[PDB]
């Protein structure tokens, strides 16, 4: 009964899904190439830059993103980068080892990510990972969640606010219609998914708080990390 995706929505789903799969670290081989961190600014310093770069590559493969002016692209990436990386770690939550996987390789514990420098944001990302188990999100659902965070019109300083809001509405309709098609065995699935979008948005602004607190002189922070704050 509930509306299933249109042809134009299936094309948008193909584009965004493939863009995610092509920029998701060790997509197939993440669980079998996992190295469990011993027992960490150092080891988390090394892996942040490639994680930002993958998010940049994801956005650069969305045609709608590429039609925006450079200064809007910069602001949109600043806004969603930690949100998208957090989501990507959270969907790689292993409930048996109670680890997240970063960069497809590094499995970390709640304690390691917390004392590694993230602080209470570590607890938020792990708690999101635990909640996202029973949601059983596929590559397409993760990609659309990412497109929705990327196309956020309330980022300060944005020029094409109206265009970005229009792009987001396309993704949200495609996303809801895919969720109808997918028929998850969870009640109020779509309302509950939008609450997760808020959880990632809260994680994005707490990263920004923790960042200002972590300032250690600035030259210790990797250059690209400083740019996306």
């Amino acid at each position: 009964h509930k509306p299933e995706p249109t042809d134009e929505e299936w094309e948008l789903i193909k584009t965004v899904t493939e863009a995610h799969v092509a920029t998701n670290a060790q997509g197939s081989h993440w669980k079998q190439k996992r190295k469990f961190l011993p027992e960490a600014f150092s080891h988390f310093t090394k892996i942040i830059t490639p994680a930002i770069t993958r998010v940049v590559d994801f956005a650069k493969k969305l045609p709608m993103f590429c039609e925006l002016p450079c200064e809007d692209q910069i602001i949109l990436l600043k806004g969603c980068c930690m949100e998208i990386m957090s989501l990507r770690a959270a969907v790689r939550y292993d409930p048996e080892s109670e680890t997240l996987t970063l960069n497809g390789e590094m499995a970390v514990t709640r304690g390691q990510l917390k004392n590694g420098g993230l602080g209470v944001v570590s607890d938020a990302i792990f708690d999101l990972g635990m909640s996202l188990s029973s949601f059983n999100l596929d590559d397409t659902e993760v990609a659309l969640l990412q497109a929705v965070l990327l196309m956020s019109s309330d980022r300060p300083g944005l020029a094409c606010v109206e265009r970005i809001e229009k792009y987001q509405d396309s993704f949200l309709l495609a996303f809801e219609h895919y969720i109808n098609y997918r028929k998850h065995h969870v009640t109020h699935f779509w309302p509950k998914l939008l609450m997760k979008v808020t959880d990632l948005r809260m994680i994005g602004a707490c990263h920004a708080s923790r960042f200002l607190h972590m300032k250690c002189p600035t030259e210790l922070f990797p250059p690209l990390f400083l740019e996306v704050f």
């Binding site: 910069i74 600043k78 250059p223």
Partner: peptide, 11 residues
């Protein structure tokens, strides 16, 4: 600023 971000985007 944002020189490195700018570079990675315009590639």
């Amino acid at each position: 600023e944002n020189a490195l971000l700018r570079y990675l985007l315009d590639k």
